[PDB]
């Protein structure tokens, strides 16, 4: 089961963890070979995959158009990639004793439970809002002075690779 | 419901020979030109129906490799930019083939599972991705001058959209396929004629 | 020998004001002949 | 019902998810010798419940401010050493009583009793107001509260000494929310 | 077989590995000792052998007479 969710906080839905286009992923009913309490700790720690599928959909997706729109979505999965290194070594740890619950799992997320939450309205104010142009180095620099430490350290990365594209420009011009 | 309990490793070598563009194998099994999972594969774990969905996404790449592969055997088995062409395709499929074959090492001589061979071949199913949009503009096509100009074309226009290693691969994709016009171009001048096979060159004397 | 002069280009801003170094090879080889 | 059955849903009580039921946590037979220790043992949840709703609730609203935001992140890195503990106790319920709880979960009472009393002393406080609220808090004394608060300050208070090394430097202060005491007039 | 392969890479063929005047080099039947899903590899690489032999058969006859076309062939020897 531990490979198993390991999987669904991938991106991977299945039997157990089913997946709805609206409100996302989370625990189909009660399961007898597991207890009637993880029930939901499981469900608090969907909360975090339904932002990763909805993250790569979008990326993927690239949608709307324009290159400093393509550059975020460049620099969106650079911020990512700690989420997904940190998953595979949670297999490694299980691999070793047999003895770790679910608990020691949801333990493990710790810092990723606490920035996607912050770094999910951003991405809803530009599919809502139709932020075309440079426009977009103002409405993630307006939330980058936000007090997180963790997230104000996540969007300076991305601004600092979105600047890449107007540096390009900029000096091919001038 | 019958299911044949395949074990884990032998998955990964599958997957390895979906990649490689060899075809028969008893999982991904094509009906029409479209690969496609098998239904009674299942591991101890994974419930029968996650490795049903990351088995989809591999076999959504294998037929960007399946389908280039049938390309490259329509033209082995004179028109002089295909054929130059390819031997750009051909040429990166080998150093391509070679990562994935030196995987297959790693795995008869340390752990290795599905979630690691795939965060492993991160940039390379990003570079495969590209190559599904850049060829799909030079299969929807009929005479000889249209399908090698629009083709040719199509490269210069979407490098300037990608303006890094993505731009290193469109490249050294893009000389290796303009080297026939070049050629005719370069020696119109010198030798002071044209000669062009199957009336190739745009200008159509 | 055309092709053999564009890669050699490479050795010594891409695909736009890079492909405008390409033609001062095709230019001054015409300047020669209409000349 | 066994006293393996009350370990096994006390490890949940400490959480929030609930024979343990929902303000104080009646349990609902057994001795009374076993119900009166799962009354003072719960009572850590109802600790741990109230500090995750109002880092929550205000993790919310963006209306907090650069100064109250970092304050509720400094609950966090708080909370995931709470998070932590409770992973090696449950790897022991495979063996632990009611009697060795006590001496395991009686310095998280502690903890969990200064900050679900640090959250309510600062509640309206947006801006450095609240970087003024949770350092009277350190006039205590007490050698493990006066450790740990003096903790938490050194971090709210690095926004306000971001904007004073501004506006001290540079001059430039900035700040849509208003939270500096130098207030700016268009 | 490893050593069976490389033999027949070179002109000589086996049982496991049969060969037909006509087709030319071609994977028997199946094997238990094989991959069910493998022979495919080793057909496309036994293509590469039947285009060998039938160098070799054309070389060895030289077969049409002429100078330029026996020395084509010591030509094709060192390609």
């Not at chain 1, 620099?75 to 004793?97: I, K």
């Not at chain 1, 075309?132 to 990365?157: F, N």
């Not at chain 2, 055997?73 to 390819?86: I, K």
């Not at chain 4, 060795?100 to 998280?108: E, G, I, S």
Request: proline content about 3%; hydrophobic content about 40%.
């Amino acid at each position: 089961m531990i490979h198993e969710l390991l999987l669904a906080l991938s991106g991977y839905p299945g039997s157990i963890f089913t997946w709805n286009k609206r409100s996302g992923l989370q625990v189909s009913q009660d399961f007898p070979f597991l207890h009637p309490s993880e029930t939901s700790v499981l469900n608090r720690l969907c909360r975090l995959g339904t932002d990763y599928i909805r993250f790569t959909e979008f990326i993927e997706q690239y949608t709307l158009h324009g290159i400093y729109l393509r550059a975020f979505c460049t620099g969106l999965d650079s911020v990512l990639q700690p989420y997904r290194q940190a998953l595979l070594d949670l297999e490694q740890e299980f691999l070793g004793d047999p003895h770790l619950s679910i608990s020691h799992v949801n333990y493990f997320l710790d810092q990723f439970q606490l920035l996607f939450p912050s770094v999910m309205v951003v991405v809803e104010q530009i599919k809502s809002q139709k932020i075309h142009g440079c426009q977009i180095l103002e409405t993630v620099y307006k939330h980058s002075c936000g007090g997180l430490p963790p997230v104000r350290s996540a969007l300076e990365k991305i601004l600092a690779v979105c600047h890449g594209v107007m540096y390009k420009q900029l000096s091919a011009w001038m | 419901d019958d299911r044949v309990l395949v074990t884990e490793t032998q998955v990964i070598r599958e997957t390895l020979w979906l990649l490689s563009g060899v075809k028969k194998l008893f999982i991904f099994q094509l009906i029409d030109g479209k690969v496609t999972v098998r239904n009674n594969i299942i591991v101890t774990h994974l419930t029968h129906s996650c490795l049903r969905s990351v088995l989809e996404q591999i076999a959504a790449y294998g037929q960007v490799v399946f389908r280039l592969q049938e390309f490259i055997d329509e033209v082995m088995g004179p028109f002089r930019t295909y054929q130059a062409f390819m031997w750009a395709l051909y040429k990166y499929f080998i150093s391509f083939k070679e990562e994935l074959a030196e995987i297959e090492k790693c795995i008869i001589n340390t752990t290795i599972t599905l979630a690691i061979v795939v965060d492993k071949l991160a940039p390379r199913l990003s570079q495969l991705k590209v190559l599904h949009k850049v060829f799909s503009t030079g299969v929807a096509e009929t005479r000889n001058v249209v399908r090698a100009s629009h083709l040719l074309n199509t490269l210069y226009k979407a490098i300037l959209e990608y303006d890094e290693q993505t731009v290193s691969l469109l490249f050294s994709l893009w000389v290796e396929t303009v080297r026939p016009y070049l050629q005719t171009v370069d020696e119109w001048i010198v030798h002071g004629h044209l000669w062009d096979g199957a009336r190739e060159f745009i200008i159509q004397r | 020998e055309l092709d053999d002069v564009h890669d050699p280009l490479l050795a010594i801003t891409f695909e736009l004001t890079l492909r405008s170094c390409l033609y001062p090879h095709i230019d001054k080889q015409y300047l020669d002949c209409c000349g | 019902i066994t006293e393996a059955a009350l370990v096994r849903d006390i490890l949940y009580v400490f959480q929030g998810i609930d024979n343990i039921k929902m303000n104080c946590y009646k349990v609902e037979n057994l001795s009374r010798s076993l119900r009166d220790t799962a009354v003072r043992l719960s009572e850590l949840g109802w600790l741990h419940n109230k500090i995750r709703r109002y880092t929550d609730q205000r993790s919310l609203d963006r209306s907090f401010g650069l100064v109250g935001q970092s304050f509720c992140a400094a609950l966090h890195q708080e909370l995931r050493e709470y998070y932590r503990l409770l992973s090696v106790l449950h790897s022991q319920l495979q063996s632990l009583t009611l009697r060795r709880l006590l001496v395991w979960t009686y310095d998280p009472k502690i903890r969990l009793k200064t900050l679900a009393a640090l959250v309510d002393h600062c509640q309206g406080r947006k801006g450095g107001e609240l970087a003024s609220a949770v350092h009277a808090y350190t006039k205590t004394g007490d050698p493990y509260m006066r450790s740990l608060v003096q903790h938490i300050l050194s971090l709210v208070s690095h926004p306000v000494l971001s904007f004073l090394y501004r506006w001290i430097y540079d001059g430039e202060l900035e700040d849509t929310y208003h939270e500096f005491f130098v207030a700016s007039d268009p």
